[PDB]
Amino acid sequence: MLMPKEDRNKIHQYLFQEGVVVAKKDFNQAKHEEIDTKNLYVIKALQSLTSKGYVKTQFSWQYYYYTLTEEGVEYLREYLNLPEHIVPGTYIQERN
Amino acid sequence: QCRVCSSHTGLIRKYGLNICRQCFREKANDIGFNKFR
Amino acid sequence: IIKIRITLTSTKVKQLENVSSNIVKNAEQHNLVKKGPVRLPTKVLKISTRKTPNGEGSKTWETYEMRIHKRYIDLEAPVQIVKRITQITIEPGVDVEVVVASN
Amino acid sequence: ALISKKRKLVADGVFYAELNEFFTRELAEEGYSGVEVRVTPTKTEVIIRATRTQDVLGENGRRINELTLLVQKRFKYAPGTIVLYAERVQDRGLSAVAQAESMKFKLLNGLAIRRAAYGVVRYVMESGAKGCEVVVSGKLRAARAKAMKFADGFLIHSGQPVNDFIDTATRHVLMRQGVLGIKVKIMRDPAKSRTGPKALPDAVTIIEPKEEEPILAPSVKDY
RNA sequence: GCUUAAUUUGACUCAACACGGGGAAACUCACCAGGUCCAGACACAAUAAGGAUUGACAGAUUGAGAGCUCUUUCUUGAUUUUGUGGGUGGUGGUGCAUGGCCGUUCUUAGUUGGUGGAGUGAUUUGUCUGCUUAAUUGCGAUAACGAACGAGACCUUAACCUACUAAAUAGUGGUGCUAGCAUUUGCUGGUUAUCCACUUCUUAGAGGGACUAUCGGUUUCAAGCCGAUGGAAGUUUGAGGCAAUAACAGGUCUGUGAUGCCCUUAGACGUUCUGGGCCGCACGCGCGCUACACUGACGGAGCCAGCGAGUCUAACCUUGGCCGAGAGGUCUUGGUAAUCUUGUGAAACUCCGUCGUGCUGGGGAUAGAGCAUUGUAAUUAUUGCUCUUCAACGAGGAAUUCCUAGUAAGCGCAA
């Protein structure tokens, strides 16, 4: 399963204030808002990302769930090389 | 769709809920269906 | 100051005669014009499905049921009278609607 | 708009039937068994009920608006109006719906199943039950499908009491030992009901009447 | 069974065989002889710019669908193609190890304790001879007297409420505008809004009412069973739902088996992209379908119902006016729901006729010519209307039956 790395905004970016990946068991339509795949990309890419931890997968009638935790400060804060108090996941928003 | 319990056939297309009927008997309670007669 | 119409179509018959009573209660403490809660014929849903996961065995079936009751009231009041009282008669499982149809 | 009438009373049940799954599949401790959806004008208030709201609150919003960001985004619901009001869910054995969750997990972290079994019983049959019902039918270290069993009571089911005594109660395993679809049914004691009937329909009780005056000599009096 | 390029298989006494909700083509896909491209978590490594690849061909190539061939300008850029060893990878053609509840069955028409009796003891009485009941239902006898689960009870329905209270999303009763009117007082109409007054019929909440009542027989005069008159109702008042002892290793959904070989990782598990699954001659136990006719066909009329269903991110119901012989086509509307389709003008039956007992006008089983629709596509007729052809078939040997008084049978044509 190839990981094509053309666009980090459609790989891992704007979940720093989301922290969640809703998905679907799908198959070939290649268009999904609010997430980084088209309809296949981050699905097979979270497969690598689950295997380093930091995302937890329920199935729950074929809707893939993912959420972040403590072992996520080690990539996002440095690949996007941004300081603290603006990225984080445990404080994902203005209140959460 | 094939939902869960070895079924893509015998789907309940009526009332717009689309459940495999093997997996309806265990979910018909909390939908709010109940047998009386 | 406009003739209105309220509908409520719920599925807990004990929790529809408390609501329809306090609707006609606070209207009659302000003594508006009204017509009584007209109760419609109820609707039942049913689906026959046989009772085995596999297919090997004798044959008769189930029958499931779900009951929907619906009744509605027409009313006229000044808007300041009604726009407060429709927000204090909430209860879970119950639906409330306002119709001001004056064609 | 363009809204079908009776389907909105059946689609929400499908919406009811799937939200409960995470309160099964994500939590184990607090007892948040019964979900409850309260739809007010323009807000869906499902009441968060947690005995230990630090998984959810934590550092002022550990999972208040963290669990919502899945489910509100799952149904394409609007943010902000997904109100999840915090509360405490009810007691462990001293509730009705929790008797699912009371025994959803209380088989052991690794010792003998009889000493698992005989623990669960003596609590609530004296302290707030005359009927509950769990499920066990498994083996002991051989190639047999042996079936030893237990329960605590006869239930209360007398007609339509099948359909208010059965409820939304489907809770899985947090046990080290035994995994399959485990189910629990719950039909409590009737002496403390406060919602509807209070005794079984065979029960009859006549009252005492009081001791009598002897003969009542006339002694008529004129007020 | 045969057959096969494969006819994908599960299940054989009631308890297999119109059933796995198995009514049909490419969805299903489990199968057959072609085509595919996708196989990587980490930890290994090398060509990692002087080159893998990302080339997807880039279109003539290229013979054979965009193609897998380079003839080259590369987004080139070590992603990963790669090369392995762990462990991956992961999912689908079966169930199995620390858990089963889902079914069908023998159909709890019966199981079990508390203090008492009897035995050294395991064990036993209660839980019986008799009558009675749909029923270990009950009376009676009695070293046994109270009692639970199951059966009663309950629960949902169908029948009675001139007693409520409350009806432009039901209906009548008037006042009218208003047309007929034999007319002459009259009997049929008239519709938004002409307005008022009504609940009997209608719908849904709250209650009531039946208990075998009351008399006559019969019986250990007991449990009860038979008549009687009243009564909406006197077959548990009619019909269902719900109730656990057991060997069918058919209970498997991202059941996991909480099995280690299924290739279980150039996968024989995916897709798109391919013709061939239930679909081949001479006999059925496949549960009635259309018969074998004058209590009948055919033709004219007469014309009565019940429970259910439905369109927005989208084609569902469909009435008039339309053309045409149907089949249909076109123009419109109406309907998110007692309002619209829909009084769902259903069929048998019903009168008036034609027909004349012959396998004739009963009965259309194989067929050739045609017009239409539905989708990417109907040949091996997917269905439907035309005209032709009318072929087994004169009540059925031996045998043997899902269906109980508005029941058995016909007659429906709603989901």
Curated annotation (Swiss-Prot), chain A:
Present with 54100 molecules/cell in log phase SD medium. The N-terminus is not modified. InterPro entries: Plectin_eS10_N, Ribosomal_eS10, WH-like_DNA-bd_sf, WH_DNA-bd_sf. This is Small ribosomal subunit protein eS10A. Its main location: cytoplasm. Belongs to the eukaryotic ribosomal protein eS10 family. It is found in: Cytoplasm. It comes from the Eukaryota. Keywords: Cytoplasm, Ribonucleoprotein, Ribosomal protein. GO terms for molecular function: RNA binding; structural constituent of ribosome. GO terms for biological process: cellular response to amino acid starvation; cytoplasmic translation; positive regulation of protein kinase activity; ribosomal subunit export from nucleus.
From Swiss-Prot, chain B:
GO terms for molecular function: structural constituent of ribosome; zinc ion binding. The modification Phosphoserine is found at residue 6. Zn(2+) binds at residues 2, 5, 20, 23. Its cofactor is Zn(2+). The chain holds residues 20 to 56 of 56 of the full protein. Keywords: Cytoplasm, Metal-binding, Phosphoprotein, Ribonucleoprotein, Ribosomal protein, Zinc. Component of the ribosome, a large ribonucleoprotein complex responsible for the synthesis of proteins in the cell. The small ribosomal subunit (SSU) binds messenger RNAs (mRNAs) and translates the encoded message by selecting cognate aminoacyl-transfer RNA (tRNA) molecules. The large subunit (LSU) contains the ribosomal catalytic site termed the peptidyl transferase center (PTC), which catalyzes the formation of peptide bonds, thereby polymerizing the amino acids delivered by tRNAs into a polypeptide chain. Its main location: cytoplasm. One of its GO terms (cellular component) is cytosolic small ribosomal subunit. One of its GO terms (biological process) is cytoplasmic translation. Component of the small ribosomal subunit (SSU). Mature yeast ribosomes consist of a small (40S) and a large (60S) subunit. The 40S small subunit contains 1 molecule of ribosomal RNA (18S rRNA) and 33 different proteins (encoded by 57 genes). The large 60S subunit contains 3 rRNA molecules (25S, 5.8S and 5S rRNA) and 46 different proteins (encoded by 81 genes). This is Small ribosomal subunit protein uS14A.
Curated annotation (Swiss-Prot), chain C:
GO terms for biological process: cytoplasmic translation; maturation of SSU-rRNA from tricistronic rRNA transcript (SSU-rRNA, 5.8S rRNA, LSU-rRNA). GO terms for molecular function: mRNA binding; structural constituent of ribosome. Keywords: Acetylation, Cytoplasm, Isopeptide bond, Ribonucleoprotein, Ribosomal protein, Ubl conjugation. There is a cross-link at residues 3, 14, 83 (Glycyl lysine isopeptide (Lys-Gly) (interchain with G-Cter in ubiquitin)). GO terms for cellular component: cytoplasm; cytosol; cytosolic small ribosomal subunit. The keyword Zinc-finger does not apply. The keyword Cytoplasm applies. Its main location: cytoplasm. Pfam families: Ribosomal_S10 (PF00338). InterPro entries: Ribosomal_uS10 (IPR001848), Ribosomal_uS10_CS (IPR018268), Ribosomal_uS10_dom (IPR027486), Ribosomal_uS10_dom_sf (IPR036838), Ribosomal_uS10_euk/arc (IPR005729). N-terminally acetylated by acetyltransferase NatA. Also partially acetylated by NatC. It is found in: Cytoplasm. NCBIfam families: uS10_euk_arch. Component of the small ribosomal subunit (SSU). Mature yeast ribosomes consist of a small (40S) and a large (60S) subunit. The 40S small subunit contains 1 molecule of ribosomal RNA (18S rRNA) and 33 different proteins (encoded by 57 genes). The large 60S subunit contains 3 rRNA molecules (25S, 5.8S and 5S rRNA) and 46 different proteins (encoded by 81 genes). Belongs to the universal ribosomal protein uS10 family. This is Small ribosomal subunit protein uS10. It comes from Saccharomyces cerevisiae (strain ATCC 204508 / S288c) (Baker's yeast). The gene is RPS20.
Swiss-Prot record, chain D:
GO terms for biological process: cytoplasmic translation; maintenance of translational fidelity; nonfunctional rRNA decay; ribosomal small subunit export from nucleus; ribosomal subunit export from nucleus. Ubiquitinated at Lys-210 in response to stalled ribosomes. Ubiquitination leads to activation of the No-Go Decay (NGD) pathway and degradation of non-functional 18S rRNA: first monoubiquitinated at Lys-210 by MAG2, followed by formation of 'Lys-63'-linked polyubiquitin chains on monoubiquitin by HEL2 and RSP5. The modification Phosphoserine is found at residues 95, 127, 219. It holds the Pfam family KH_2. Keywords: Cytoplasm, Isopeptide bond, Methylation, Phosphoprotein, Ribonucleoprotein, Ribosomal protein, RNA-binding, Ubl conjugation. It comes from the Eukaryota. One of its GO terms (molecular function) is structural constituent of ribosome. One of its GO terms (cellular component) is preribosome, small subunit precursor. There is a cross-link at residues 104, 130, 139, 149, 198, 210 (Glycyl lysine isopeptide (Lys-Gly) (interchain with G-Cter in ubiquitin)). The modification Omega-N-methylarginine is found at residue 144. It is found in: Cytoplasm. The modification Phosphothreonine is found at residues 42, 68. NCBIfam families: PRK04191.1, uS3_euk_arch. Belongs to the universal ribosomal protein uS3 family. This is Small ribosomal subunit protein uS3. It comes from Saccharomyces cerevisiae (strain ATCC 204508 / S288c). The gene is RPS3.
